Design a protein around this motif. Structure first.
Motif, PDB file in Angstrom:
ATOM      1  N   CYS A 388       0.886  -1.197   0.000  1.00 30.57           N
ATOM      2  CA  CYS A 388       0.000   0.000   0.000  1.00 30.57           C
ATOM      3  C   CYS A 388       0.909   1.229   0.000  1.00 30.57           C
ATOM      4  O   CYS A 388       1.808   1.249   0.855  1.00 30.57           O
ATOM      5  N   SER A 390       0.801   5.228  -2.585  1.00 34.30           N
ATOM      6  CA  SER A 390       0.284   5.952  -3.784  1.00 34.30           C
ATOM      7  C   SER A 390       1.415   6.314  -4.758  1.00 34.30           C
ATOM      8  O   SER A 390       1.262   5.999  -5.964  1.00 34.30           O
ATOM      9  N   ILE A 393      -5.197   8.625 -10.206  1.00 36.08           N
ATOM     10  CA  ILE A 393      -5.218   8.080  -8.818  1.00 36.08           C
ATOM     11  C   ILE A 393      -6.196   8.929  -7.988  1.00 36.08           C
ATOM     12  O   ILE A 393      -5.724   9.619  -7.056  1.00 36.08           O
ATOM     13  N   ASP A 394      -7.499   8.883  -8.323  1.00 35.35           N
ATOM     14  CA  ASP A 394      -8.596   9.610  -7.615  1.00 35.35           C
ATOM     15  C   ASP A 394      -8.800   8.955  -6.239  1.00 35.35           C
ATOM     16  O   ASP A 394      -8.036   8.024  -5.931  1.00 35.35           O
ATOM     17  N   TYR A 395      -9.767   9.421  -5.434  1.00 37.03           N
ATOM     18  CA  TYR A 395     -10.226   8.720  -4.203  1.00 37.03           C
ATOM     19  C   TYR A 395     -11.670   9.089  -3.848  1.00 37.03           C
ATOM     20  O   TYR A 395     -11.931  10.254  -3.507  1.00 37.03           O
ATOM     21  N   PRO A 397     -13.729   6.399  -1.438  1.00 35.79           N
ATOM     22  CA  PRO A 397     -13.508   5.044  -0.921  1.00 35.79           C
ATOM     23  C   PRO A 397     -14.391   3.927  -1.514  1.00 35.79           C
ATOM     24  O   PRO A 397     -15.549   4.166  -1.820  1.00 35.79           O
ATOM     25  N   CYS A 414      -6.275   1.289   0.990  1.00 38.02           N
ATOM     26  CA  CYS A 414      -5.333   2.357   0.580  1.00 38.02           C
ATOM     27  C   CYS A 414      -5.680   2.867  -0.825  1.00 38.02           C
ATOM     28  O   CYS A 414      -6.489   2.222  -1.513  1.00 38.02           O
ATOM     29  N   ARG A 415      -5.085   3.996  -1.224  1.00 37.90           N
ATOM     30  CA  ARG A 415      -5.433   4.742  -2.467  1.00 37.90           C
ATOM     31  C   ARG A 415      -4.925   3.985  -3.702  1.00 37.90           C
ATOM     32  O   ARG A 415      -5.655   3.924  -4.700  1.00 37.90           O
ATOM     33  N   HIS A 416      -3.699   3.470  -3.639  1.00 35.90           N
ATOM     34  CA  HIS A 416      -3.081   2.659  -4.711  1.00 35.90           C
ATOM     35  C   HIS A 416      -3.966   1.426  -4.960  1.00 35.90           C
ATOM     36  O   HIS A 416      -4.354   1.230  -6.116  1.00 35.90           O
ATOM     37  N   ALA A 418      -7.109   0.856  -4.177  1.00 38.24           N
ATOM     38  CA  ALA A 418      -8.476   1.220  -4.596  1.00 38.24           C
ATOM     39  C   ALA A 418      -8.484   1.565  -6.086  1.00 38.24           C
ATOM     40  O   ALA A 418      -9.526   1.343  -6.722  1.00 38.24           O
ATOM     41  N   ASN A 419      -7.377   2.090  -6.617  1.00 37.53           N
ATOM     42  CA  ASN A 419      -7.266   2.408  -8.066  1.00 37.53           C
ATOM     43  C   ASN A 419      -7.094   1.135  -8.887  1.00 37.53           C
ATOM     44  O   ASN A 419      -7.856   0.964  -9.862  1.00 37.53           O
TER      45      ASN A 419
END
Ligand code: LL0
Ligand code: LL0
Ligand code: LL0
Ligand code: ZN
Ligand code: ZN
Ligand code: ZN
Length: 454
Positions: A388, A390, A393-395, A397, A414-416, A418-419
């Protein structure tokens, strides 16, 4: 060695019941004249209405089976049938439309070809089992001349308007009345014995004859597909990008890595038997496993018999990635193309098979559910043991039983990851939308994947 010489001989025996008295000695030059066209010594990129087998193969996406039947020329109405399933009745005074004059029939022919072909091809190749009436009907709705461009774009012209005296491509042909510089190929010149029906039915139980023009047109195109793509196969030949080719292929490579990597992690098979494309690479180069490759070209006619492909695969897992067999063993991971899919990339084929044309052309044996009795559908999931973080790469959740990461096990994706999830689910939908189906050994349990982090 390029085009079909207008001075090539044309066997006329098949024509002679519709055209009694027709010369035995005939060339394309003379036939085109007989059909009512003038060629005009022109070297302007249309050197013959008729084309070679090899030209026809290069342009399979433009194939429309075409056939005419005399319901009673001038002294009778004609039923025009096409491999679209359409049947038009022209009078000179399943779809079966009653009798109308040629001025409306020709406007319908253009709309139909335009809609069928605008996302497929820069032309049409009328695929014939020529008995005479189809070749004499063409003057009523075809015009030839120099190769030309669309008045509204840079594509080659495929239609002409007598109203506006202008030319158009398949996108811009709206209201146009003449097919302009069509190609054709007569299947009966390929050296066959007997009638269309007898030759079609050697190879295909899926299409019948309802004694109607469109059936003949469908059977004609089918037989042509059989001779060009089932019995003869040429994987050398490339075909233009017309759609989501590139996305589908990358999508296929990502799902393959995901699925096989997950399977080795959960069940720890000590050996993977990779059975298909003799060019295939390891889809999981880092996996701790004995990778053994087995060579098998794409079967274009019948699915392989598993009894002949394996003559200790019961050890570890077997990977059939688009290797079509009759019955997969229980210890398999499997990707099989579903021939039943409707797309621009997937053309109607032979005996319920489909011609899947993606960079190369692959006639695929009919989809059979009974091949998969020892397996189940592969369940959707995304898995990552990647860290995990970034970087880059939006967010908004993401909320998922199927996102199998350390972060989601925790309860905070995590953001990575979730993308990557959203991406993977796109690639997955992409691949399924394209007609591929995934199958796995019955013991495969997503819940096992959560314990591959401790
Ligand atoms: N798939 S397999 O390994 O059973 C096989 C298939 C066709 C020929 C040979 C062969 O293996 C044997 F030659 F060693
Ligand atoms: N997965 S499989 O299809 O190779 C298989 C078949 C029978 C028994 C165990 C078994 O392994 C299972 F642990 F996965
Ligand atoms: N088997 S499980 O309980 O983990 C589960 C439950 C609902 C949806 C997906 C799923 O598998 C997940 F791992 F992808
Ligand atoms: Zn155009
Ligand atoms: Zn058929
Ligand atoms: Zn994460």
């Amino acid at each position: 060695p390029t085009h079909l010489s207008v001075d090539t001989k044309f066997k006329t025996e098949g024509l002679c019941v519709d055209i009694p008295g027709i010369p035995k000695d005939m060339t394309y030059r003379r036939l085109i004249s007989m059909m009512g066209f003038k060629m005009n010594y022109q070297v302007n990129g249309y050197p013959n209405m008729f084309i070679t087998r090899e030209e026809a193969i290069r342009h399979v996406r433009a194939w429309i089976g075409f056939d005419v039947e005399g319901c009673h020329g001038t002294n009778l109405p004609l039923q025009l049938g096409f491999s679209t399933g359409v049947n038009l009745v022209a009078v000179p005074t399943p779809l079966m439309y009653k009798g109308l004059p040629w001025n409306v029939v020709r406007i319908k022919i253009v709309q139909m070809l335009s809609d069928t072909l605008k996302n497929l091809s820069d032309r049409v190749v009328f695929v014939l089992w020529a008995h005479g009436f189809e070749l004499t009907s063409m003057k009523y709705f075809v015009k030839i001349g120099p190769e030309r461009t669309c008045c509204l774009c840079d594509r080659r012209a495929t239609c002409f308007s007598t109203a506006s005296d202008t030319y158009a491509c398949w996108h811009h042909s709206i209201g146009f009345d003449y097919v302009y510089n069509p190609f054709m190929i007569d299947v009966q010149q390929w050296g066959f014995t007997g009638n269309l029906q007898s030759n079609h039915d050697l190879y295909c139980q899926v299409h019948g004859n309802a004694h109607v023009a469109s059936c003949d047109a469908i059977m004609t195109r089918c037989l042509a597909v059989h001779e060009c793509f089932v019995k003869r196969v040429d994987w050398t030949i490339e075909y233009p990008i017309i759609g989501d080719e590139l996305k589908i292929n990358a999508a296929c490579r990502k799902v393959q890595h995901m699925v096989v990597k997950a399977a080795l992690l959960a069940d720890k098979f000590p050996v993977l038997h990779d059975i298909g494309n003799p060019k295939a690479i390891k889809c999981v180069p880092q996996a701790d496993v004995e990778w053994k490759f087995y060579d098998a070209q794409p079967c274009s006619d019948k699915a392989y018999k598993i009894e002949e492909l394996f003559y200790k695969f019961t050890d570890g897992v077997c990977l059939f990635w688009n290797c079509n067999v009759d019955r997969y063993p229980a210890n398999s991971i499997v990707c099989r193309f579903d021939t039943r899919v409707l797309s621009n990339l997937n053309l109607p084929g032979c005996d319920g098979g489909s011609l899947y044309v993606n960079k190369h052309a692959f006639h695929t044996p009919a989809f059979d559910k009974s091949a998969f009795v020892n397996l189940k559908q592969l369940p959707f999931f995304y898995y990552s043991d990647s860290p995990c973080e970034s970087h880059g790469i939006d967010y908004v959740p993401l909320k998922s039983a199927t996102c199998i990461t350390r972060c989601n096990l925790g309860g905070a994706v995590c953001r990575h990851h979730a993308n990557e999830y959203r991406l993977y689910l796109d690639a997955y939908n992409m691949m399924i939308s394209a007609g591929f189906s995934l199958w796995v050994y019955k013991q495969f349990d997503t819940y096992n994947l959560w314990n591959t982090f401790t």
